[PDB]
């Protein structure tokens, strides 16, 4: 089943772009301090998440 792997990984490439815009890291974004989330989202992210949804 070669191809749906790559379809859904293109969607996951959008999701790693979202992680990048949130923190900066591709995958291993720490970003969650004990004591709540640190350094909140830049203005212009929730509409992108709406589009992805």
């Amino acid at each position: 089943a070669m191809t749906p792997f790559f379809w859904m990984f293109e969607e996951r490439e959008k999701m790693f772009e979202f992680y990048e815009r949130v923190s900066g890291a591709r995958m291993h974004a720490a970003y969650v301090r004990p004591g709540g989330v640190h350094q909140d989202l830049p203005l212009g992210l929730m509409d992108d998440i709406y589009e992805f949804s």
Binding site: D40, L41, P42, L43, G44, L45, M46, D47, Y50, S53
Partner: protein
């Protein structure tokens, strides 16, 4: 002033329904299509084989008449 990122007046919906059209064609009709094309091929093949039998009879006449 504050410049966080909330949703701008709220966000629209996103569906979660499994879109499968189950098309379809009412497969008994597809059996009708397959048997129809099958019988079409049989009728045309039947006609062409019998006319080539006619012309092969002409080739038999060629070898009969040419021989002595």
């Amino acid at each position: 002033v504050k410049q966080d990122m909330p949703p701008v007046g709220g966000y629209g919906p996103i569906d979660y329904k499994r879109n499968l059209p189950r098309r379809g064609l009412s497969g008994y009709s597809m059996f009708a299509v397959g048997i129809g094309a099958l019988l079409f091929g049989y009728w045309s093949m039947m006609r062409w084989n019998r006319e080539r039998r006619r012309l092969q009879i002409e080739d038999f006449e060629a070898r009969i008449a040419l021989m002595p």
